[PDB]
């Protein structure tokens, strides 16, 4: 029931089908899977707000065709 765009910081973007009631963890798994990057190795924001693994995607107010940003995490 919702299609959104996840955009890398290296330019690329990919479409994901999500429900507002899946977790951020779930969506990270969808992204890990599609983009072949471990889940520990990146984070997601929506409109400046970091997305927390445990939270439902709905909490961030995602709409159809909105852009979630994928950020590579430096493991310092």
């Amino acid at each position: 029931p919702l299609s959104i765009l996840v955009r890398n910081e290296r330019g690329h973007s990919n479409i994901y089908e999500v429900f507002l009631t899946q977790t951020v963890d779930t969506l990270k798994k969808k992204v890990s899977q599609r983009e072949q990057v471990h889940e520990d190795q990146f984070w997601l924001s929506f409109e400046g707000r970091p997305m927390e693994d445990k939270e439902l995607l709905g909490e961030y107010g995602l709409k159809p065709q909105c852009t979630v940003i994928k950020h590579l995490r430096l493991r310092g």
Binding site: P50, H71, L72, R73, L74, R75, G76
Partner: protein, 316 residues
């Protein structure tokens, strides 16, 4: 026949420690109520042999403290207080040396990234809206930082011992910061698609990824455009106390008087090390407790901070 068990320490106030044997066939939640470890909620997991010797924070399911949490921490996460206090059990064993006139942290538990965060914040005209958060910030500026670091782990959803990313941590913290009148206007120009103006507020107004140079962003930076072509983006207008400019760690030159401070990152994405560079009368490099000074500097940098008040470009 004996029951599989481990010895762990338990505490409801971070001062008093009681020894406990835990039964391996039941979650901690079944045995102690709501229970936390290293900043994680372990209420619903079973004991693991590796938890032996660890200290656990137990915090009864009360929901009176839910009102406390909201008003003092600006959070509705019921797990927040427990995560915060279990972390605090560790961060109280961290040492906080006063180095080059700032509070820093002695190496332990992969806390180099939190050291950078702490060092950087002290130089920014910034402030936090969550009362307990601000008070902790205040105290960390005076050398008493255990609480602030635990809140940082907690607001960022990190555990003690976990490798981390300064930019990612800053993004979590700044959600709680006094940035309600921070403002940024960017113009994007694509030959094919044309010209479009973007107005940002809050965190997104003071934070940028793609270049370490505040000059580059004013004079224009290349960004991919919807149409596939590369387009130019530049800073139209900026009203804020500071800006944070980030980029994948690259070899980079820091010249005294052209920046506030910055984070060096050595290593690779899988495992690395942060140190902090600030500018007083000369350049200071802070690597936890260890300090080096130098008139100039060159190395792998990934965030650079600048002081700001108001900016207006001189391009159309």
């Amino acid at each position: 026949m004996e029951v599989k068990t481990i010895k762990v320490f338990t505490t409801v106030d971070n001062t008093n420690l009681h020894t406990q044997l835990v039964d391996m066939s039941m979650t901690y939640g079944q045995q102690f109520g709501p229970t936390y470890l290293d900043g994680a909620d372990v209420t619903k997991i079973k004991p693991h042999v590796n938890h032996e010797g660890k200290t656990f924070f137990v915090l009864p399911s009360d929901d009176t403290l839910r009102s406390e949490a909201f008003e003092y921490y600006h959070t509705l996460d019921e797990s927040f207080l427990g995560r915060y206090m279990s972390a605090l059990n560790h961060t109280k064993k961290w040492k906080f040396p006063q180095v080059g006139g700032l509070t820093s942290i002695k190496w332990a538990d992969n806390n180099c990234y939190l050291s950078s965060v702490l060092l950087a914040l002290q130089q920014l005209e910034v402030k936090f809206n969550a009362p307990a958060l601000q008070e902790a910030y205040y105290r960390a500026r005076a050398g008493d930082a255990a609480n602030f670091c635990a809140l940082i782990l907690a607001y960022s959803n990190k555990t003690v011992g976990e490798l981390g990313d300064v930019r990612e941590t800053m993004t979590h913290l700044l959600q709680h910061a006094n940035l309600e009148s921070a403002k940024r206007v960017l113009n994007v120009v694509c030959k094919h698609c044309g010209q479009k103006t973007t107005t940002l507020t809050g965190v997104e107004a003071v934070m940028y990824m793609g270049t370490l140079s505040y000059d580059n962003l004013k004079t224009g930076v290349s960004i991919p455009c919807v149409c596939g072509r590369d387009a130019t983006q530049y800073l139209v207008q900026q009203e804020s106390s500071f800006v944070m400019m980030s980029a994948p760690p690259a070899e980079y030159k820091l010249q005294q008087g052209t920046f506030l401070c910055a984070n060096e990152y050595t290593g690779n994405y899988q495992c690395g090390h942060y140190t902090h560079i600030t500018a007083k009368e000369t350049l200071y490099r802070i690597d936890g407790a260890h300090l080096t000074k130098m008139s100039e500097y060159k190395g792998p940098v990934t965030d650079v901070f600048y002081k700001e008040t108001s900016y207006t470009t001189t391009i159309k």
